[model samples]
Target: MVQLAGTYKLEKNENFEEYLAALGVPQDSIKKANSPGVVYEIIVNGNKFTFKSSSGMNSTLIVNEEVEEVLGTVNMNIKSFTKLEGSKLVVNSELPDGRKGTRTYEFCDKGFVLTMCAGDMVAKRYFIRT
Candidate 1:
């Protein structure tokens, strides 16, 4: 579980702009998001998992419990369910309009990768341990 606890700095992004477009994000915002400087800090304590992002999004989630979370991108709330599946931490989300999305975090040799999916569009963000 310590493998999931670290400060990670964004290194690369793949298909992020397209994925954000699918989520209805504005082009200007997508441009900014594609730049860099994003970081994520993950903390795990027993059944509690805490996530802090450079984008000012913070969440403390209990495994298997669904909670309301703010999606800073679209400035909306979503139902978020976070869980551990094998070696990966998976988060599933549902928009108020019924749109669904998933984000999975898996540790890699360098650091960890965040894979985001919504509809058929998929995006990946690579981070290195800081």
Candidate 2:
């Protein structure tokens, strides 16, 4: 399917503050960014990237950032990239140990929302979607 791809950001949304809080961000950081501004980068190029954090907590998911897929402390070397299906962006990763997770992203309240699925269990991790 054809999809729109590029870097998305919170600055595009007016309700960025509330969006960050929804992602379980602290209030102090949000307040601090009330003026001036803070930035979080998500580099998505064919599902590969290097996410970088800025001065603000930003509370952003680093692109090209891979996490071990494990139900426990054991780590898995699975990696996934950003892919857009229609209006939803999907993150599909496979673990080194065989475990894998698929995450979905969508725009909400002028921000982006992510839905992660690991096997039968599903965890919807919230991000700034920037």
Candidate 3:
């Protein structure tokens, strides 16, 4: 739980399993999706800057009104979105094919936490508190 409020690196290899769980991803699905032998790195800067990347899986994440927001050339094929709910920031994205979902986020604990909802599957990756 960082309190400085800065970007953090995220990997899918070790946490992919847990990430899948948070997205209601089934074990069989994780196996079927075939998560490439790569790590997805999410770098969040200034609470409004972002860049993400994987390998051949496809990678892309940009944030705020910033330039050069593209996260990676190795990119991850996924849907992307960003929004701020009052004091909370949110991000939700999934694979382009729609078989897998990465996460959405809100501000919390000087960092973000993986979050999800039950209905309509409305979810966020994490939230960091100021």
Candidate 4:
């Protein structure tokens, strides 16, 4: 299994705004989050995974044992977990409003791609090693 422990800089985004809106994110914060200033840092140790996301205004950190996650501009308590399925790392999440989503990280040539899918909406973010 590929251990995801590194700093990843955001390279590109697709349909991220639509994905946020579907997640019930406020327009104001969504605008800020949608900017090209966010980066992700992942630390995976054994069964524990810590994910850190930073933007211009604020940042968020979520651990494998934690139940809270950032939904667009605000923070929310969600049921989420990460596991390895085949050649990808899959993250499953569910909101209190019955909205469910999955984030899959697939290692690639230059770096990796993080794909988030919820219902019919999907978004893709490309990242490269720092």
**Top TM-score prediction, candidate number:** 1
Model 1, residue pairs in steric clash: none
Model 1 CA RMSD to the hidden true structure, in angstroms? 3.7
TM-score, every prediction: 0.67, 0.41, 0.45, 0.64
lDDT of 4 by residue, 1-130 (tens): 4354555566665556566667676656655665544676654433444455565334444443333455435433455566565445566756575667787767453666768787667867766666
What order do candidates take by TM-score, descending?
A: 1, 4, 3, 2
The digit string of per-residue lDDT tens for model 3 on 1-130 reads: 3223565444223344454454455655554343433344444444454545344344555553211212223222335465545444455555443444424455443555545443334333332332
Model 3 lDDT vs. the true structure?
A: 0.43
TM-score of 4: 0.64
The segments of candidate 2 whose C-alpha lies over 4 angstroms from its true place after superposition are: 1-76
Compare candidates 1 and 2 on lDDT and give the better one: 1
- Poorest lDDT segment (10 consecutive residues) of candidate 4: 57-66
| Residue 108's lDDT in candidate 2 | 44
Which of the two, 3 or 4, has more TM-score?
A: 4
Name the regions of candidate 3 deviating beyond 4 angstroms. 1-4, 11-38, 64-78, 85-87, 92-103, 108-111, 120-130
**Model 2 clashing-pair count:** 2
Better of 1 and 3 by lDDT: 1
